[PDB]
């Protein structure tokens, strides 16, 4: 890697002007230009990762994997980089190291936007939303509005940040792509013979910038039978079924501003 960097400024100095032995240095410059492939970094880190796994090492393989992904970004092959990052977020989230987690998250969003993988884009964006208090507020707002845009098809505003090719990437997508922390509150689990339950779940929003209040759906849990706070009139359940009934929510179906979260912090049971 240092060698590639050194090549960068070696170029730069070569642009300066270019009487004895200097042509040799010129062919040297050209030959190391041949060396600008720097996939050797990839191969070396490949071997390093394997060997680290050999002694039951996860993080050095994990960190060198982030190095692999970042050089993929320098390689421009953002696809493999986002594949790596997609594998690498879960372990960071389990690891809880709140410093690194957002630090890789911003890069992962960068890969999602360049790739146009709008599904991964929205998922990582909403997980960022869930706890985005470390970053600046207005940036959270821009993320949210871009998210709503892409749920309803509008491209995100950082047009200068985007390129026409990536514009094509994500305009092309969404043909298959389909479908802040809050809490589920059930007043009565283990139903008796006759009762009713209304909107008791409480949708707390950890984000400062409010989620826009338009709609929402809850899908009636099949457990047993198939069926700044905001408290409202939704109140789905109004009927009677068999007793000893419990409930459990898969996902928010969050139709507040967005269509749905696509990321599973819709806890089933806290």
């Amino acid at each position: 890697m240092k060698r590639r960097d050194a090549a960068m400024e070696a170029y730069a100095a070569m642009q300066a002007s270019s009487v004895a032995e200097q042509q040799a240095n010129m062919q040297l410059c050209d030959q190391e230009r041949s060396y600008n492939h720097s996939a050797a970094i990839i191969a070396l880190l490949s071997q390093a990762m394997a060997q680290f796994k050999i002694y039951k090492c996860l993080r050095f393989r994990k960190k060198l994997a982030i190095d692999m992904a970042e050089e993929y970004l320098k390689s421009g092959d953002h696809a493999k980089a986002l594949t790596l990052y997609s594998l690498m977020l879960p372990d960071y989230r389990q690891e809880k190291w709140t410093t690194i987690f957002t630090d890789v998250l911003l890069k992962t969003l960068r890969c999602a936007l360049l790739s146009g993988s709008v599904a991964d884009y929205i998922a990582c964006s909403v997980e960022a939303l869930s706890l985005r208090h470390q970053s600046d507020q207005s940036e959270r707002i821009l993320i949210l509005e871009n998210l709503w845009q892409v749920f309803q098809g509008v491209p995100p505003m950082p047009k200068t940040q985007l390129t026409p090719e990536a514009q094509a990437l994500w305009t092309s997508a969404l043909a298959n792509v389909k479908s802040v922390e809050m809490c589920a509150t059930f007043e009565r689990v283990q139903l008796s013979n006759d009762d009713l339950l209304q909107l008791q779940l409480i949708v707390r929003v950890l984000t400062d910038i409010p989620l826009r209040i338009r709609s929402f759906h809850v899908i009636l849990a099949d457990a047993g039978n198939p069926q700044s706070y905001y408290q409202l009139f939704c109140s789905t359940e109004a009927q009677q079924f068999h007793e000893n009934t419990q409930l459990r929510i898969v996902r928010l179906e969050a139709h507040m501003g967005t269509d749905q979260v696509a990321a599973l912090l819709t806890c089933s049971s806290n």
């Binding site: 680290f52 002694y55 039951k56 090492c57 996860l58 993080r59 050095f60 994990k62 960190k63 690891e95 809880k96 190291w97 709140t98 410093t99 690194i100 630090d103």
Partner: protein, 138 residues
């Protein structure tokens, strides 16, 4: 002589300030320093990183200008300073004394009833405790 202080909980890190003797730690390895730790565990952990002894780790982990010296308590807390000096004329004895001091300062921040254990060290007092440690032994 950058002492990246890092107390670790069971798994996560309650306090890991970035300070030394002179002034703040500029070098941008912090979150990935904690990532050095997550390779000090899940890798350089072996069957050893947790023990039932007041843990002398003379260089459980080493690298250029960055040398990790570790400690663990029966409560599974990970105590780690890093020797960020390729070498300086300080010998492990004062490092042992420093882990004594850090043990005591951490557990006296623990002495707070208000502060729930396992959370970010709120105490500006335990701060200045760590700060005097850094200003002295770095």
């Amino acid at each position: 002589m950058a002492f990246c202080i890092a107390v670790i909980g069971k798994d996560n890190a309650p306090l890991y300030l970035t300070t030394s003797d002179m002034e703040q730690e500029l070098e941008l390895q912090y979150h990935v320093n904690a990532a050095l730790d997550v390779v000090e565990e899940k890798c350089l952990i072996g069957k050893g990183a947790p023990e039932s002894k007041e843990l002398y780790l003379g260089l459980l982990y080493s690298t250029e200008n960055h040398k990790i010296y570790g400690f663990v308590t029966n409560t599974r807390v990970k105590f780690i300073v890093v020797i960020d000096s390729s070498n300086v004329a300080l010998r492990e004895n004062e490092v042992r004394a420093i882990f004594r001091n850090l043990h005591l300062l951490y557990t006296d921040a623990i002495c707070n009833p208000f502060y729930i254990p396992g959370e970010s060290l709120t105490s500006k007092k335990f701060d200045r405790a760590v700060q005097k440690l850094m200003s002295g032994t770095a």
